[PDB]
Design a protein around this ligand. Structure first.
Ligand SMILES: Nc1ncnc2c1ncn2[C@@H]1O[C@H](COP(=O)(O)OP(=O)(O)O)[C@@H](O)[C@H]1O
Ligand code: BEF
Ligand SMILES: [Mg+2]
Lengths: 50, 210
């Protein structure tokens, strides 16, 4: 009752979040200069970390 | 601070201007590095720059704005433009564009186009409302382009014989067939002078290859 079991799904979601926080910091520092009418919501995101 | 304002004045004005701005000796650099360093040091004082140039499409997707000072070639002062602007505002080769520009940002090496203001001497809002070239219906020339000055100068004869030998019109297809050292250069110069005098509304451009 005090020991919890985690499956592959929970670990995968955890690692997805670990990558997502890095991509979040990246998109936040990239949004510091992006203005209106200059970029589509595609270039600010990279595949690398996640 | 516009790009053309440094694009057209001779190298000497650039020399005195940079020597006034407290520069490293600009006489050691090329015209393009002259304008590049001057625009760098101007933006280093905190000014938003304006610029202009003709667009060239590259195969990697992005485009580059060239000037007539470099005869439309690659240079340090060419303005980089992203492919997505070419998408949204419907850009392509030949579109001359003037608008907001900034020097290359941190780690970059070419100017960036912020805000489009004039596309081929038009509003960028109507620039998307254009007709293509191959979809055009060609015709023969109907409007006469009179080449005679009417002042009767000594060289003007070479123009009047034009109106007597081979008439020209808007959209004409003309071929000059002549051996070397026969007088093609003076003929072409008189053609350009007469067109720029009698028809200043039509844009006039000249190609000199090799
Ligand atoms: N209208 C003119 N009046 C006087 N001289 C002329 C005229 N047209 C041509 N010339 C002579 O011809 C020469 C032109 O040389 P160039 O421009 O090299 O001819 P091309 O381009 O046909 O080789 C000049 O040296 C000039 O003296
Ligand atoms: F005909 Be020359 F070479 F201009
Ligand atoms: Mg010649």
């Amino acid at each position: 009752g005090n020991r919890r079991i985690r499956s592959v799904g929970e670990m995968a979601e955890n690692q997805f979040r670990v990558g997502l926080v890095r991509v979040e910091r990246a998109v936040k520092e990239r949004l510091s200069l992006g203005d209106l009418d200059t970029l589509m919501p595609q270039d600010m995101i990279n595949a690398k970390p996640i | 601070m516009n790009l053309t304002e440094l694009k057209n004045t001779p190298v000497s004005e650039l020399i005195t201007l940079g020597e006034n701005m407290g520069l490293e000796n600009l006489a050691r650099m090329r015209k393009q590095d002259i304008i590049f360093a001057i625009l760098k040091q101007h933006a280093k004082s905190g000014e938003d720059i304006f610029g202009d140039g003709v667009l060239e499409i590259l195969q990697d997707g992005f485009g580059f704005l060239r000037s007539a000072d470099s005869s439309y070639l690659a240079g340090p002062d060419d303005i980089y433009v992203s492919p997505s602007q070419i998408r949204r505002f419907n850009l392509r080769t030949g579109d001359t564009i003037s608008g907001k520009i900034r020097p290359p940002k941190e780690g970059e090496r070419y100017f960036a186009l912020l805000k489009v203001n004039e596309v081929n001497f038009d509003k960028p809002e109507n620039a998307r409302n254009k007709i293509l070239f191959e979809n055009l219906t060609p015709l023969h020339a109907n409007s006469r382009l009179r080449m005679e000055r009417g002042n009767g100068s000594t060289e003007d004869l070479t123009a009047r014989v034009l109106d007597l030998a081979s008439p020209i019109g808007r959209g004409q297809r003309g071929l000059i067939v002549a051996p070397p050292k026969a007088g093609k250069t003076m003929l072409l110069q008189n053609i350009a002078q007469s067109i720029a005098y009698n028809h200043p509304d039509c844009v006039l451009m000249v190609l000199l290859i090799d």
